[PDB]
Ligand binder design. Structure first.
Ligand SMILES: [Zn+2]
Length: 52
């Protein structure tokens, strides 16, 4: 149950509701997220996502 925020745009990701805008299920945590995931804002790796 950890949230993160992009360090490029400044958008926060809510794994609680998932990202259906991309096709991600509402039951997928950040650790569950895919390895080919990218910010829904720009499209950067988790390497750009830190802990809120
Ligand atoms: Zn971003």
């Amino acid at each position: 149950m950890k949230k993160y925020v992009c360090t490029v745009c400044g958008y926060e990701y809510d794994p609680a509701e998932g990202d259906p805008d991309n096709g991600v299920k509402p039951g997928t945590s950040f650790d569950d997220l895919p390895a080919d995931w990218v910010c829904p804002v720009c499209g950067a790796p988790k390497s750009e996502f830190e802990a809120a």
